[PDB]
Amino acid sequence: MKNFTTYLSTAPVVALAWFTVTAALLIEINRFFPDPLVFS
């Protein structure tokens, strides 16, 4: 597990995770607060 976690830390894996979370966050934000053209 020490070496599996090392692999899950490599750049390609970490970037895949970080982006997925960021993408999902934006998607979910528009899902509940849609059409955000202005900050009102």
């Binding site: 070496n3 599996f4 090392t6 692999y7 490599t10 750049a11 998607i27 528009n30 899902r31």
Partner: protein
């Protein structure tokens, strides 16, 4: 000499320790990164097993295991298609009304207004019209419900897990020894009979028991949800007997050699089914039955462990003559001790097969309600043509790799391999001359027609109205195969395809297959294809012959396959390697295939595809290929510009995704011209200035940022160049043909 299973127990251990050590495969990249190049290197050198080690036992085990995973991902892809066609699809709705309902099997989430992509494909469904021809494939498989698709999907996923397990088992557990892999006589004997022969016979079983009765009932008008389920045909002989009376006898006619009795499910009708517009399913069953007996017998030719059989090594050596020196003696070892030699030969035939399949499938639509689905036909023909063209280019690349890595001057003394490397300047020179001739005598009679038309002299042009150049040879072969069934092939009730000639198959008021007529423009476009095919071969063949040496740089073999240039001397020696002959032979492949797909797109829309009206048929473009294709302007005004209207006006409609991709494709294609027209020297220094800014604010990265290698930039540009152009055509074709 004994053919036996040889395996080494538990060779590679299964651990993640290597997973955490990037570059463990290469002695050079195991030392970690110090420049940003290592990142791009550990990927550009991960599948090159030959580079990782010198043992051909390990390289083979890696190759054998790799293939397994590939199969696994293929299964996953296939299983996903069935699942998406099981839950998110309109297959069942399409079954009832295949003509007026467009296939759809991709539904987008309702977000960022992307729900517009879910267009009204008809049948109470709003999704994305697919062009993969899976609905018509499932129909001809008998699938009449989404429970037979769900089960198949699950089965594919199970197979996937078996494949990856097999790859790990045959690598980390029971790893075959080299002596196992080098039994070519055994492989061919088992791949011809066991794989191809049994694979066809097993299909001839399904087609005869499930696909034929189900399709007959579907074409008879029976509701899909009222047809007896497949198994009932197998068990209940009465049902199958009613559909095919020959099941009243049984398997007796076969053993009694009275096969004739089975002339109701095994026939040589020929042509297309008048109801569905696709090859009769009965004829396909008979084909797979025959193809099987052939392959099964072919599997008993090469010698294995007993005595009967042939020795490929002896055969090759036996074939030598008064002009080719020693002959094919010495190729057997090359093709049993090299993976690059085998791959090259395999890719070439495999890629060519893909193009041949595309020509046959479109000419003789094999699936029900396929020809009237114009988008599916076009999308399939264009697809296979590319998939194949790429393989061929790979065949040239690996051939060169073997020449610079696995060629041994000692084994090849007077082989037809040394005797060709010894006249490379005659082969190349003559091919160069024919390319120039074909060039002027194919593209010139196009500029001539352009100039003569522009100068207002349209009687001095090369057309069916003026100086005609009809393809007489192609026009005679068309007639020898249209009148073939009445003479050459009596048993065949009709010709192989309507393309050769005859009436026009119409299904649902649309042209399934219409006799294609070849005129001056066909002659002109066909010779244009020849010129491109010849050029592409010249670039790749030149790379293979001089892959080891040439008058310029007589030691390239010692330099490698992927080496940028020997130096700026000798008046410049850039792109001398065989990788750079593959790099350029990709652009020409794109140019060669692009004209072919455009030729098919225009010819068909103009001379085949259309609606059969009272007295006459209305073609998508009103039959303007003949007079409009003899000039380059006609290919821009009546093809590119005219047919580009659908994609440029797809915005706001379900097809708006293609308009966006159409432009996005232009951007990718153009973006590629920054790596194909530039040089690292400029980027490396530019990066130096950027690093300075970073080092001032103390934000400089520990790994040294380095510009892409000379070879890398060549690869990045060609990759984006091909991706952009093909994507542009994919959007164009799909939005044009789906809209019209």
């Amino acid at each position: 000499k004994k053919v036996k299973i040889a395996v080494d127990r538990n060779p590679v251990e299964t651990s993640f320790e290597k997973w955490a050590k990037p570059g463990h495969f290469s002695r050079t990249l195991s030392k970690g990164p110090n420049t940003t190049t290592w990142i791009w290197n550990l990927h550009a050198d991960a599948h090159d097993f030959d580079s990782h080690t010198s043992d051909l036992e390990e390289i083979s085990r890696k190759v054998f295991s790799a293939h397994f995973g590939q199969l696994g991902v293929i299964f996953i892809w296939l299983s996903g298609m069935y699942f998406h066609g099981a839950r998110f699809s309109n297959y069942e709705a399409w079954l009832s009304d295949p003509v007026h309902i467009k296939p759809s099997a991709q539904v987008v989430w309702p977000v960022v207004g992307q729900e517009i992509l879910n267009g009204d494909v008809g049948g109470g469904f709003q999704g994305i019209q697919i062009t993969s021809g899976f609905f018509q494939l499932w129909r001809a498989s008998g699938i009449t419900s989404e429970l037979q698709l769900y089960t198949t999907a699950i089965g594919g996923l199970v197979m996937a897990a078996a494949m990856f397990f097999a790859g790990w088992f045959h690598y980390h557990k029971a790893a075959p020894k080299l002596e196992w892999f080098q039994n070519v006589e055994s492989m061919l004997n088992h791949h011809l009979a066991g794989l191809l022969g049994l694979g066809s016979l097993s299909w001839a079983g399904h087609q005869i028991h499930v696909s034929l009765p189900v399709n007959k009932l579907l074409d008879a008008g029976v509701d899909p949800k009222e047809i007896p389920l497949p198994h009932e045909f197998l068990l209940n002989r009465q049902i199958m007997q009613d559909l095919y009376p020959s099941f009243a006898k049984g398997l007796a006619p076969f053993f009694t050699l009275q096969w004739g009795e089975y002339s109701d499910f095994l026939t040589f009708n020929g042509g297309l089914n008048p109801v569905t517009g696709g090859l009769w399913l009965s004829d396909t069953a008979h084909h797979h039955l025959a193809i099987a007996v052939l392959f099964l017998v072919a599997g008993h030719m090469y010698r294995t462990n007993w005595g009967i059989g042939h020795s490929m090594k002896e055969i090759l050596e036996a074939h030598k003559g008064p002009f080719t020196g020693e002959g094919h003696v010495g190729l057997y070892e090359i093709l049993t001790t090299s993976w690059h030699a085998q791959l090259a030969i395999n890719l070439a035939l495999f890629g060519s097969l893909s193009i041949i399949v595309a020509h046959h499938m479109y000419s003789m639509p094999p699936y029900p309600y396929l020809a009237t689905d114009y988008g599916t036909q076009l999308s399939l023909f264009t697809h296979h043509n590319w998939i194949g063209g790429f393989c061929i280019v790979g065949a040239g690349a690996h051939a060169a790799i073997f020449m610079v890595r696995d060629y041994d001057p000692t084994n090849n003394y007077n082989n037809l391999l040394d005797r060709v490397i010894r006249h490379r300047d005659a082969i190349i020179s003559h091919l160069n001359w024919v390319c120039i001739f074909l060039g002027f005598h194919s593209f010139g009679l196009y500029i001539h027609n352009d100039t003569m038309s522009a100068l207002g002299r349209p009687q001095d042009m090369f057309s069916d109205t003026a100086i005609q150049l009809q393809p007489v040879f192609a026009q005679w072969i068309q007639k020898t195969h249209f009148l073939a069934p009445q003479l050459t092939a009596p048993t065949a009730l009709a010709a192989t395809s309507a393309t050769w000639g005859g009436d026009v198959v119409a299904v649902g008021g649309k042209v399934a297959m219409m006799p294609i007529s070849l005129g001056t423009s066909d002659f002109l476009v066909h010779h244009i294809h020849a010129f491109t095919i010849h050029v592409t071969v010249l670039i790749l063949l030149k790379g293979v012959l001089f892959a080891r040496s040439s008058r310029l740089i007589p030691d390239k073999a010692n330099l490698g396959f992927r080496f940028p240039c020997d130096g700026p001397g000798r008046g410049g020696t850039c792109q001398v390697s065989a990788w750079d002959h593959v790099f350029l032979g990709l652009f020409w492949m794109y140019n060669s295939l692009s004209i072919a797909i455009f030729h098919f797109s225009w010819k068909m829309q103009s001379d085949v595809w259309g609606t059969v009206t009272a007295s006459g048929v209305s073609h998508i473009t009103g039959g303007n290929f003949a007079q409009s294709a003899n000039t380059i302007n006609g290919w821009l005004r009546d093809f590119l510009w005219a047919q580009s209207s659908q994609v440029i006006q797809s915005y706001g409609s379900a097809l708006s995704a293609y308009g966006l991709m159409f432009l996005g494709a232009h951007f990718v294609w153009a973006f590629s011209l920054m790596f194909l027209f530039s040089g690292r020297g400029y980027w490396q220094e530019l990066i130096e200035s950027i690093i300075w800014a970073h080092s001032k604010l103390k934000v400089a990265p520990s790994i040294q940022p380095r510009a892409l290698s000379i070879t890398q930039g060549r690869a990045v540009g060609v990759a984006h160049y091909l991706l952009g152009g093909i994507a542009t055509t994919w959007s164009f074709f799909l939005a044009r043909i789906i809209a019209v």
